[PDB]
Subunit: 328 residues, 4 copies
Amino acid sequence: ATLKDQLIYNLLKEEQTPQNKITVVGVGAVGMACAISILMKDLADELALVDVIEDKLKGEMMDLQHGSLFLRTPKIVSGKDYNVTANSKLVIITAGARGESRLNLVQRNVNIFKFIIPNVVKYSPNCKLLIVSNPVDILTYVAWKISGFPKNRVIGSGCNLDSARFRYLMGERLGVHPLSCHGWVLGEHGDSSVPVWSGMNVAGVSLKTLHPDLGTDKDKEQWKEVHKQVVESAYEVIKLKGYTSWAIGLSVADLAESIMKNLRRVHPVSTMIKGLYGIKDDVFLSVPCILGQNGISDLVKVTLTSEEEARLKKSADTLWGIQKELQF
Amino acid sequence: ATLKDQLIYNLLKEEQTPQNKITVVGVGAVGMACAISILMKDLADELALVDVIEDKLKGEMMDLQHGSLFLRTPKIVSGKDYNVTANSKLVIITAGARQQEGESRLNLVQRNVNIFKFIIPNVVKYSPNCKLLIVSNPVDILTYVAWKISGFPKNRVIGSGCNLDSARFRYLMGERLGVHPLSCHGWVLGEHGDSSVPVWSGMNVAGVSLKTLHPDLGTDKDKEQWKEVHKQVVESAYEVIKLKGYTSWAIGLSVADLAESIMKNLRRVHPVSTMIKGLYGIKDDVFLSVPCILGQNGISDLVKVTLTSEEEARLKKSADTLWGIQKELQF
Amino acid sequence: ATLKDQLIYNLLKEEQTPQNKITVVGVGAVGMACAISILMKDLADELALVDVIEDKLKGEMMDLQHGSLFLRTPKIVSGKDYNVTANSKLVIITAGARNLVQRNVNIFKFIIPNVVKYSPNCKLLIVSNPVDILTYVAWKISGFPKNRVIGSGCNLDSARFRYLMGERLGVHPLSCHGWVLGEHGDSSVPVWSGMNVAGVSLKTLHPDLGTDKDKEQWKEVHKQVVESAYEVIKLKGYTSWAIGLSVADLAESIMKNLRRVHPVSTMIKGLYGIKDDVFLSVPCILGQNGISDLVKVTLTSEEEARLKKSADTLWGIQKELQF
Amino acid sequence: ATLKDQLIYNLLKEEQTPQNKITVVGVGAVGMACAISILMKDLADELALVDVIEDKLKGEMMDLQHGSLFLRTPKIVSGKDYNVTANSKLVIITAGARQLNLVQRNVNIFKFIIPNVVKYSPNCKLLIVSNPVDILTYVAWKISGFPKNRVIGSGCNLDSARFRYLMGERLGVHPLSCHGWVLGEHGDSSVPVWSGMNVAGVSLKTLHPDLGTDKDKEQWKEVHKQVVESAYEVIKLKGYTSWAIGLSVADLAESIMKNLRRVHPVSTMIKGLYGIKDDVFLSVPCILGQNGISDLVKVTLTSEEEARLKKSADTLWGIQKELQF
Ligand SMILES: NC(=O)c1ccc[n+]([C@@H]2O[C@H](COP(=O)([O-])OP(=O)(O)OC[C@H]3O[C@@H](n4cnc5c(N)ncnc54)[C@H](O)[C@@H]3O)[C@@H](O)[C@H]2O)c1
Ligand SMILES: NC(=O)c1ccc[n+]([C@@H]2O[C@H](COP(=O)([O-])OP(=O)(O)OC[C@H]3O[C@@H](n4cnc5c(N)ncnc54)[C@H](O)[C@@H]3O)[C@@H](O)[C@H]2O)c1
Ligand SMILES: NC(=O)c1ccc[n+]([C@@H]2O[C@H](COP(=O)([O-])OP(=O)(O)OC[C@H]3O[C@@H](n4cnc5c(N)ncnc54)[C@H](O)[C@@H]3O)[C@@H](O)[C@H]2O)c1
Ligand SMILES: NC(=O)c1ccc[n+]([C@@H]2O[C@H](COP(=O)([O-])OP(=O)(O)OC[C@H]3O[C@@H](n4cnc5c(N)ncnc54)[C@H](O)[C@@H]3O)[C@@H](O)[C@H]2O)c1
Ligand SMILES: O=C1C[C@](c2ccsc2)(c2cccc(Nc3ccc(F)cc3)n2)NC(=O)[C@H]1Sc1ccccc1Cl
Ligand SMILES: O=C1C[C@](c2ccsc2)(c2cccc(Nc3ccc(F)cc3)n2)NC(=O)[C@H]1Sc1ccccc1Cl
């Protein structure tokens, strides 16, 4: 006859599995920004956090739990052991560590993924994996290989942020909200991204039709500088604050909304492009994909120029060059 | 002319005054948590950021701007100069470094008072009709400091106070009962932090007084040890500092809740630090948390809580202690 | 090859099922208000609409569908056949007469079996009046465990009370706490004991609260809750917005498994000396399994007698019903 | 002392003018759908409702007020007198009755409303929903004396939303990712812009040159025919349209109230574009901010699409010239 017993009469002890659970692996700057954005978008009924730094993991879990009054996510759990991640609909991988080269980081992150992915598959075999950790294009393949999951359930963040940055920069130039400034950045994430000028428009008005020299070395207004700013801005943010968190966190939560709510919205995400643009290797690049409750259900076939297809093909060859030497 | 001129025809390029602007002073862990929580709640049509560290300031602003597509705040500005804060409806002060395990309360006071001596006048200059929401610690002491420097009426000088303390309390209360913190009512008042007062009489679930059902609630004679719920509020705060070095998300979410009541003129009750001269035998200019009605004018009214002799004494002790520090402050 | 096949390359087409399906039965004023409220709150990935009038049903579905760009619900279906309601998490019954019992029992004789058929693990949410009797009618026919059979009850009555309380105190209803229990409508019970703002008891500050002795006439606040229902019906012809919003609020707690306390009509048999199978409003913890738990309110001898009276009156009607 | 005084200590007894006030004129099915959507989107701090039928008006005000606990708009008001509408940022006109005859009928109604709206909210943005929207936006503009930026019509925002829903249903994609612009005269004379129809920036006309032509194998012209055919179908099936228009008005209200600077196909003064030299209000993509229509998107139209806008303008002016104010 405790206070709970005097106040509450129990009708059932029938404990059930979470219906719309999400897991964030890596409680670093990126992962925590993904965690807060998801929590504030009301996408999960349960949020699980995983990391190797036990103390930092407990602290972040508690800090999010103390905001439970202001949230609509009734359960916030964490732990080093992946048993906490059981029955997750979506698993977001952000684990890693932000002079070093890009090749040095690959096998370094592959060894990390060699533990995470099996443990994720163990407790959540029917989940959708959203890979954020860089190189995202390579690590999405790495995860797809180790998991043995079909292509659709292995999604890479890719150029979702690149396009968001593009649409914002396009928006500032024209003085219009990014929501109404349409433009697509595809292929390899980072420096090797492809700005698809043909699709760059405002209210169905192709900016290439009005300005035929758009995104060329000829261009009077030099619109190619907008894409140059997409790569520059990212480097600038690291030079100014040392890392990125908010923008990536928001972009990930948008992808989470499409998947969790089965919206069938189009996003520039990393999927296997094998069979397209003369690519025959098992490589992942960003193309606009249809995101639903089972991940990439479909992908949009973008008509590109010979110069744009070659850019994707070069990226595809370079990524496979690193992939064929990888140990699994 | 140019692509912009060929694509878009202009009807006017006039006025451009902010209707629902918010400023965040101090782009640290707490300041940035307030910012993201505010942006994701669609409370501002303009967000401004201020800080002494130019690099971090520019970096944080850009990181927010790059996420614009997933937000409804069409303008994010930042600067060391306070011209960027002009016409704010609400200014949040999260400036000044967090308390070092080495430094004490009095050391944190003196340091943050010197900081405020230049923040508050500059905030007032560009936003003379704004609401000041003080977060920087010791929140109670600094809400008084802000009030004195600004020359603003009591209503427009609000301190975060016990909003977080009560939020932690309702979470813990909910965890024990298997109920959502929204349905678990409990108020933590007075001095924010270690000296906070849990009001056991107001502890309820669906109007049912927990103290009426369980008279031993709050007392040391409690077999269920419910007094540990308030001890855990204090313990958890210290624990998060030991575990991750600071607190950001919890305070960021509670400040956004306060901002929501102000910006939308909701008139919801919140445990926030306000001028308590006239209540509980207090005769000095001390700012302690009591349930306040928050709207477009900040604190329009406050709720008179029936405290027990013991609960009253703790409020009086904090008032006597805080006035002791405040009476020896140079302006 | 079509323009679709040329634009979109498919990976998988096997029609995936909804994970958060909600069904609304009766596309009347109430049903449609529930629908829009549920849609504007992003609670469903699929919305199902059922009505005997096929023309109004098709139009209501179409009108909602044309606003899909502003909503986050990718699929909105409708039909006379309950096959369109297959695998719903929550089913809302708003179908019925705006004697009032007799016809609605005959309606539920067809509705309830057809719902259970296509959605056996769903939570039933009864709105149709007399809500307290029809929740029993729905529970009786379904054979569902009492936790999965919920009635709107006094959630709206408590909403109206907190609005009036708020208007009187100049405070938002969110910060004005008060509970209206028992029967929905006239026989409802205001729990003055629990009526508060910021934990401060109004009955402690104003002992006359609820009595006829009361100079401030706070007993009128509860009478106004009853008055307003009839008043809106007289002025407008019916009530829709308020019930729609309250139903969506319950839907949010059930769908998101929040575990928030709500005054909803439940099997109160076992408490307050009640022995008959009657559904009356008491504070309930709502989640993914419906009413998982119940809040035992400390009631006065007057309040407790009012619920037993409600129980005896309702059962008196319930025993005379033919199933 | 009263219970209120014993419980609450006052610091200042207010009162400030409403900061984000919205007014809805006409508490019919359209206006009440605009009301619930605005409320559920947290766009206003004050909502004012105005109508001639006092009984319906008080009943609707009370119903919304009873759900205040589930809303974030602390003040809902109503009245026959326009004093309840004072200091509004946006005033929405939905006054009329479902359906030259209907024009002059609604002109006479507007002849009273607009002056009363201007008297209490002279700095407000006017949003016209009442049909014929393109003609009644002109009527309101001339009566108000407001500059063209503060006089907006719902126009083809709903026509585009319907097009995007149908487009999305065909392709199995969300209407958010299906982009299509329906411009000009709202209703029967609406103009679909095929050159702008796209998914992920991929022009559907470029891949399928038969798009929007008679020789179309997939008959995409029927998508636009279904846009206008849907309106009549809903009218025939349930007697009126409410939910779809309410949501689209809330969308416009969001862009205005939050100064988003988003692009919407709304009815505006088109004198000077596509060979139109008359004072007519036609739908084109507009930037919607705090000052209403600040700018507009100059859509590249084919001579057939251009001629259709001219034909709309000619028919509208024919009606507009025969009106008495
Ligand atoms: N795809 C994109 O668009 C995009 C954008 C920005 C950042 N990123 C990437 O996000 C990643 C992380 O960034 P960050 O700022 O959060 O780094 P961080 O150093 O702040 O945090 C990384 C976390 O990973 C954890 N971790 C390392 N090994 C682990 C393991 N075996 N198991 C569990 N956790 C482990 C660390 O403990 C650490 O907490 C980087 O790789 C970065 O490149 C991707
Ligand atoms: N009221 C509460 O419940 C509560 C909860 C947690 C933290 N806090 C308080 O919030 C404050 C900050 O927390 P933090 O973790 O973000 O510290 P922080 O060191 O991470 O950030 C502080 C920021 O203030 C900036 N700053 C310093 N001097 C400044 C000046 N003169 N003008 C403008 N900006 C200046 C710093 O550059 C820094 O960005 C602390 O005082 C802390 O105690 C209050
Ligand atoms: N619980 C509450 O708080 C509350 C509040 C207000 C109204 N109500 C009740 O809700 C009910 C309906 O309200 P209303 O205003 O929408 O009335 P309404 O007449 O406008 O709507 C009733 C609808 O039910 C349909 N219907 C009738 N029989 C049906 C059947 N066998 N299957 C499917 N659909 C059927 C009708 O065609 C009609 O569309 C009434 O009983 C009313 O009293 C309850
Ligand atoms: N632009 C669009 O996309 C679109 C779509 C659908 C409907 N509509 C239009 O919206 C209008 C209204 O639709 P409805 O179904 O709500 O009509 P309704 O019959 O349901 O009610 C209209 C209201 O206008 C009121 N009204 C009449 N004269 C008034 C006056 N002088 N002052 C204040 N109120 C007055 C009536 O009293 C009535 O309540 C119609 O003209 C209709 O054509 C526009
Ligand atoms: O991919 C990342 C990680 C990175 C980054 C990577 C290359 S430049 C910036 C990031 C985050 C945290 C640490 C680092 N470290 C780092 C910086 C420069 C470098 F050359 C190697 C490592 N980088 N920051 C980012 O915002 C994103 S998006 C991005 C990056 C480049 C071009 C265009 C875009 Cl849309
Ligand atoms: O007031 C703060 C700042 C603080 C803090 C202060 C005292 S214990 C924790 C915080 C933030 C950043 C740094 C520090 N460090 C610090 C703490 C105590 C000390 F003595 C020296 C340094 N503290 N963290 C917090 O969560 C909040 S809320 C809180 C604090 C104590 C009890 C109950 C509550 Cl709801």
